[PDB]
A paper describes a structure:
Pathogenic bacteria commonly employ the Type II Secretion System (T2SS) for the release of protein toxins. In numerous species the targeting, assembly and stability of the T2SS secretin in the outer membrane require the function of a small lipoprotein that binds to its C-terminal region (the S-domain) and serves to pilot secretin monomers from the inner to the outer membrane via the LOL lipoprotein sorting pathway. In this study we used cryo-electron microscopy to characterize the structure of the secretins from [name] and A. hydrophila and in addition determined the crystal structure of [name] from [name].
Crystals of [name] from [name] (residues 2–113) diffracted to 1.75 Å at the ESRF synchrotron in Grenoble. The structure was solved by molecular replacement with Arcimboldo Schredder with the structure of AspS from V. cholerae (49% identity) being employed as a model. The floor of the cavity, formed by the central β-sheet, is decorated with hydrophobic resides (Ile48, Tyr73, Tyr89, Ile91), and a disulfide bond generated between Cys74 and Cys111 stabilizes the cavity wall formed by α-2 and α-4. [name] employs the central part of its β-sheet to interact with α-12 of EpsD*. These residues include Leu65 and Tyr73 from α-2, as well as Tyr89, Ile91, and Ile93 from the β-sheet of the pilotin. The EpsD*:[name] complex fits in such a way that it allows the hydrophobic residues Ile639, Ala641, and Phe642 from EpsD*’s α-12 to be placed within [name]’s pocket. However, we also observed that residues located in β-1 of [name] as well as the loops that connect the individual strands in the central β-sheet can clash with amino acids lining EpsD*’s α-12 if the pilotin is to remain in this conformation in the complex. This suggests that, upon complex formation, not only must α-12 from the secretin move away from the central β-barrel, but the pilotin itself must also slightly open its central tunnel in order to accommodate residues from α-12.
Author numbering:
A (entry chain A), B (entry chain A), C (entry chain A), D (entry chain A): 5 to 114
């Protein structure tokens, strides 16, 4: 429906607002800098501190992104209802190194 | 021409690359975090440290943006050739507070 | 008295504790990183962001230190009772550039 | 000798200077903020990012301090000659959580 799409867009906007108020927040070498929405997508922008780690663990950042969002009760409900999360991770130079959609399908077996 | 547009797009991409290598760089309460390009536009993303200043001097940020880009010899040449700069400034929460194009016209009397 | 010295030492320790809980806090190009006590002295350690300003305004940092502590109602009372503040400011390299006692006498005419 | 003590004090001062020029530098959740000397001691002050980790791994910070300084060719030579390193680690609040001497004896079996 148009009404279900409208509801998801309003949910994505509200949830981006809620999460924005607490920024920036660090989780080890990740610093969450910016949260936005677009349609039914919550966009999470983080700096991965390449300067501090001397590493670029792309595989690990992706696998831990999928598992952490999927295992969060609130995000998992949101995904199943039709919200999607877009995870953008930049290195210390601000260069984009990960740009990955997490959807309800991401959490399912395949 | 198609060739002049192609040249400006290649210039915007190269110049975004050059400036990215030095990031992040601070200019008082501004921290330049990310530089990108799109077509003939160099996009400059900065955090204005609202937490540290307790202020939101929107007028000042805009007037000093126009004057600083216009008065830079290299940027002024680039603007006159057809490159444009897009200045995006976020507060401490990552919320967008300025999104302003600077073009060759920005430097002229009116 | 021994008892008045003991009271001032306990006050300096408690006040260092109170202020520590809120750190780090920025005031423009100053970042308060560490607060300690020693006897009747509250020690305030800040980084002055020499990298961001490209300046070392020693005179200004000293005059604004004396005036800001002297004009604060709580600090002014504390100073008059016999507490002292030691202001240590380091540059971006962590090198000590100011180490200045502020006492009750600092606020008086001379 | 007085001359060997003087040589170690001059070495500690010079080495503190050398290391200061590169600050701040991050090694994962450690940020080296300040390096000083006192007599034959190089003092290393770091922030351990308790806010980002949600942990206080005191044992690990101490064991990895001893092993990293002992296993560094230059530091190991310096220690054997009579220089000592004092490792001070503060949490996110600037509160001192580790203050540990590393000496030539630290690297030996016992
Ligand atoms: O890693 S996801 O499938 O839970
Ligand atoms: O402020 S611009 O017109 O130089
Ligand atoms: O500057 S002090 O004397 O208030
Ligand atoms: O851990 S130290 O003994 O090399």
């Amino acid at each position: 429906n148009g009404e279900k799409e409208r509801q998801l867009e309003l949910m994505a906007s509200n949830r981006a607002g809620v999460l924005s108020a607490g920024l920036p927040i660090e989780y080890g070498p990740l610093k969450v800098m910016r949260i936005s929405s677009s349609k039914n997508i919550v966009e999470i922008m983080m700096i991965y501190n390449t300067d501090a780690t001397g590493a670029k663990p792309t595989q690990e950042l992706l696998s831990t992104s999928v598992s952490k969002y999927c295992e969060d009760a609130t995000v998992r409900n949101q995904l199943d209802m039709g919200l999607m999360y877009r995870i953008k991770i930049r290195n210390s130079r601000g260069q984009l190194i990960i740009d990955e959609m997490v959807t309800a399908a991401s959490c399912q077996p395949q």
